[PDB]
Symmetry: D2
Subunit: 97 residues, 4 copies
């Protein structure tokens, strides 16, 4: 019994990087900036499945986007950890502007 939800509205940092799995499923990375206080926070968002395809085709540097997903910390050595907002079938993405 848990909940793990993240909601972001911000600007795409650089043009998305789309990659494809051995099974051919797209996965797309962006960085995403939100501002508070004025302070900029950078988020690593990774899209999977159909939304990865929509991300890489429609987002550019500067895009304002809404993003809904869940937090997962990815373990990767050479021991380091990247916390990412994972956007898949249980989440959402909407291009604004």
């Amino acid at each position: 019994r848990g909940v793990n939800k993240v909601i972001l509205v911000g600007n795409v940092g650089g043009d998305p990087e789309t990659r494809y799995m051995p099974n051919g499923n797209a996965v797309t990375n962006i960085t995403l900036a939100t501002s508070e206080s004025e302070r900029t926070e950078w988020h690593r968002v990774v899209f999977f499945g159909r939304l990865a395809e929509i991300a890489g085709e429609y987002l550019r540097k500067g895009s304002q986007v809404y993003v809904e997903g869940s937090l997962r910390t990815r373990k990767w050595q050479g021991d380091r950890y990247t916390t990412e907002i994972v956007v898949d079938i249980n989440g959402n993405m909407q291009l604004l502007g």
Copy 2:
């Protein structure tokens, strides 16, 4: 500008730590485990930080294995490890702009 919102429901990993800093502020850190339950024929760990009033309420009531609702913001803190290399810790900051609700 922008929106930076995190909503978690999970169990507190360990007894909370409350620390008061020279400015008189409570800051309490916990870890939080959120679990998703699969099916075919699991666990995520979050670092949460309370400041201010909710820091006081967190330190008082939360214990090992308390169920809690947490609403905060994402914050990633850069730091150089002892090996010289930069590393990154992403936390969930819960302050006056957030919200906490003990559950049960």
Copy 3:
């Protein structure tokens, strides 16, 4: 391009009502109380699909529950002939339900 999301943590006011349709799709109705002196807001939450059966199985009066859904306002003509409006929280495959406690 739109977002329509509701998130509630609250207490069920009474036992669920799960209604099955000829198709075998279930619909489950509850009301749900959230409190901010103390001030209680009552929500009408309706579950569709699998989550209708899961809510029907697991929610009871007094249950503390998290729900994530979407807002839906239903228009209807009252016996007085006048337009009325019921705004509900719709929980279906795009939503979530987690029994708390």
Copy 4:
């Protein structure tokens, strides 16, 4: 002990209406359209304090907006009529988009 949270991103139906209470504080109301792919949903949003002024000043028919608030059902009144509104106050948030 509860949570009562609403998050909408959609488009304003018409120009905001803003009024002033005795104490001088603004209150802005709008309707907001959210569309699901085809089928539109209309929400009644009410802003209080600071955000009411901001909403009053920069929102107009068709403005794309992010809104964060709480649900509140207000019984009014010649019998009773109940409206459920999205109340955006100090605890909420609003972001103009585009």
